[PDB]
Chains A and B, each alone.
Chain A
Amino acid sequence: MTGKELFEMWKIINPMGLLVEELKKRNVSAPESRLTRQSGGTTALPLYFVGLYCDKKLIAEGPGETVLVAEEEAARVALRKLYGFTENRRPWNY
């Protein structure tokens, strides 16, 4: 598993849903999506960073070719950061 990612090792669907219920377990309000940054909003090569915020502060921000994909991929980023299984994590102690 060294080299791979959490969500190509644990195949999920509706990651925004998983984020919503897991934050209900954490007793924090359901997060808001905001459109943090963008480019090319009216062509077929857009960029959208959609950020996931909760009570004036963010837990994630993520890219996408459209707003829905960006939001759901930022939900994946939030789930990685909440489970601590990010890209930066302390590599395994062989």
Chain B
Amino acid sequence: NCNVELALTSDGRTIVCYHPSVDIPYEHTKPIPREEGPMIEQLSKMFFTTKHRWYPHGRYHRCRKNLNPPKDR
């Protein structure tokens, strides 16, 4: 997919790109219709990940955790 209008100036010195937002038409839209082992396995199958994500980590890793991290943007 690529749909733009490219051009040069007369001098051949700068390029001009022209490229507006194509919108989604009305027709292209649908309308709105209106135990620990089992525990970790059903989490894994609910979130499409594996069980080592859900097994805990000790006090030592949780203490190396940062709790007040910097925030940007």
**Chain A residues at the B interface, C-beta cutoff of 8 Å:** 33-38, 43-45, 50-51, 53, 56-58, 61, 67, 71
B26 in the interface (beta carbon within 8 A):
yes
B29 and A34 form a contact (CB under 8 A): yes
The 8 A CB mask of B21-48 against A (1 = contact, 0 = none) is 0011110111110000000000000111
Interface SS of chain B: loop
Expressed in whole angstroms, the Cα–Cα distance for A61 and B26 within the complex equals 12
Known: A51-B24, A57-B23, A61-B24. A34 touches B30 (CB 8 A): yes
Expressed in whole angstroms, the Cα–Cα distance for A53 and B32 within the complex equals 13
| Residues of B in contact, count (CB < 8 Å) | 12
Q: Which residues of B contact A56 (CB under 8 A)?
A: 25-26
Q: Which residues of A contact B30 (CB under 8 A)?
A: 34-36, 38
A36 and B47 form a contact (CB under 8 A): no
Known: A34-B30, A36-B29, A50-B32. A58 touches B23 (CB 8 A): yes
Expressed in whole angstroms, the Cα–Cα distance for A33 and B31 within the complex equals 7
Q: How far is the CB of B43 from chain A (nearest CB, A)?
A: 10
B47 and A33 form a contact (CB under 8 A): no
Expressed in whole angstroms, the Cα–Cα distance for A78 and B32 within the complex equals 18
